[PDB]
């Protein structure tokens, strides 16, 4: 039974790694949004 108690934590690691992947995807999305402040075309409309 102790081995099942030990492999449940190896499933918990999979849970937290999927959470880590989702948060990394949000960081990679919002850093791309934040670096491109205004687009190349949002500058064109201010010029217009």
């Amino acid at each position: 039974m102790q081995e099942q108690a030990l492999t449940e934590l190896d499933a918990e690691k999979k849970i937290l790694e999927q959470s880590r992947a989702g948060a990394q995807s949000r960081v990679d999305s919002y850093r791309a949004l934040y670096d491109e402040n205004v687009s190349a075309e949002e500058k064109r409309t201010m010029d217009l």
Binding site: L16, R20, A23, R26, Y30, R31
Partner: protein, 48 residues
């Protein structure tokens, strides 16, 4: 026609300010996800 022109440039300033507030909200969401990564990494270390 100068009144129409100054209304146009007021709309220009309003668009640029709306985009700057949009970038500030993106910065807040970026820092949320970037702190959530560090929280999930400390949670992985606690699971280890």
């Amino acid at each position: 026609l100068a009144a129409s022109a100054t209304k146009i440039t007021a709309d220009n300033i309003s668009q640029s300010e709306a985009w700057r507030r949009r970038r500030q909200e993106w910065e807040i969401q970026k820092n949320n996800a970037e702190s959530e990564i560090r929280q999930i990494d400390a949670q992985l270390e606690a699971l280890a």
